[PDB]
Amino acid sequence: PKRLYCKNGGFFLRIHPDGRVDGVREKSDPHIKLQLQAEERGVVSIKGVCANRYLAMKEDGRLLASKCVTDECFFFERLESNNYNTYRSRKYTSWYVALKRTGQYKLGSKTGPGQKAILFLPMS
Q: 86, 78 in Cβ contact below 8 A?
A: yes
CATH of 1-124, one of 1.10.10.60, 3.30.230.10, 2.80.10.50, 3.30.720.200: 2.80.10.50
List Cα–Cα distances, 14 to 30, 65, 70, 87, 93, in angstroms: 9, 10, 20, 15, 23
Instruction: Give φ, ψ of 114 to 5 degrees.
Output: 105, -25
Q: Which of 56, 36, 32, 38 is nearest to 46 (CA)?
A: 36
CA distance 102 to 20: 16
45 beta partners: 37
**79 burial via Cβ count (<10 Å: 0-12, 13-18, 19+):** exposed
Q: Which of 36, 19, 49, 26 is nearest to 103 (CA)?
A: 26
CA distance 26 to 32: 9
Instruction: Give φ, ψ of 82 to 5 degrees.
Output: -95, 10
Annotated binding-site positions for heparin: 8
CA distance 25 to 103: 8
DSSP the chain: -BEEEETTTSPEEEE-TTS-EEEE--TT-GGG-EEEEEEETTEEEEEETTTTEEEEE-TTS-EEEESS--GGG-EEEEE-TTS-EEEEESSSTT-B--B-TTSSBPPGGG--TT-GGG-EEEE-
Resolution of the determined structure in angstroms stands at 1.6
Name 69's Cβ contacts closer than 8 Å, sequence gap at least 6: 45, 54
CA distance 48 to 73: 12
- Beta strands 43-48 and 75-79: pairing type? antiparallel
Annotated binding-site positions: 8
